[PDB]
Write a protein that binds this ligand. Sequence first.
Ligand code: HEM
Length: 188
Amino acid sequence: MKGTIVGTWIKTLRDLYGNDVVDESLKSVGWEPDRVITPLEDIDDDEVRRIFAKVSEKTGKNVNEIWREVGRQNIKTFSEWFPSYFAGRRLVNFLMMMDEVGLQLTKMIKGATPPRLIAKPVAKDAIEMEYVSKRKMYDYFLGLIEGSSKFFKEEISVEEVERGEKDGFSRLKVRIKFKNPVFEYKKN
Ligand code: HEM
């Protein structure tokens, strides 16, 4: 990953799991517990992987479970660093815009590699959102969704539809139902 995102993860882990757990885990991979990560740095995905593995060991929580929790809380962290994205009224609009934001950053930020988050309405009160990535952060993705619902104070039901790997790409499709109708058939 790029530096920006790893910065948020470290912060979120600490908020979640305390300072000693994180300090220790970063040292285990040879990092400085209080490393200053710059946005445009490139960070070894395997190093991150080993960090989270250590957090798993120290806390006794399954790594997948940690990512789920990290995903939920990281929305709070990210909204504090980058408030403008969260400035809108609605959860649905937030979610529907995310794919565009991702495409744009791939273009703007050298080396940046965010997943596709393809969203499309499937009923008056529902969209499908498909995560597509070379990485595979199924639990993180799901966590982010819940965190978003939490931030926007809009209850949603999330049901997983498809999960699988093809051609080196991990995919996860969910159906997200909103409380009220948000879509309308309008003509082509
Ligand atoms: C709120 C504004 C957001 C911005 C500006 C943003 C942008 C980014 C960036 C820059 C990365 C890292 C790319 C890299 O380091 O190579 C990333 C990773 C990721 N983003 Fe977002 N994101 C946002 C919200 C979300 C939301 C709401 C979701 C899910 C609904 C999401 C899904 C993911 C996932 C799952 C990753 C991990 C990388 C992977 O799985 O391949 N992001 N995002």
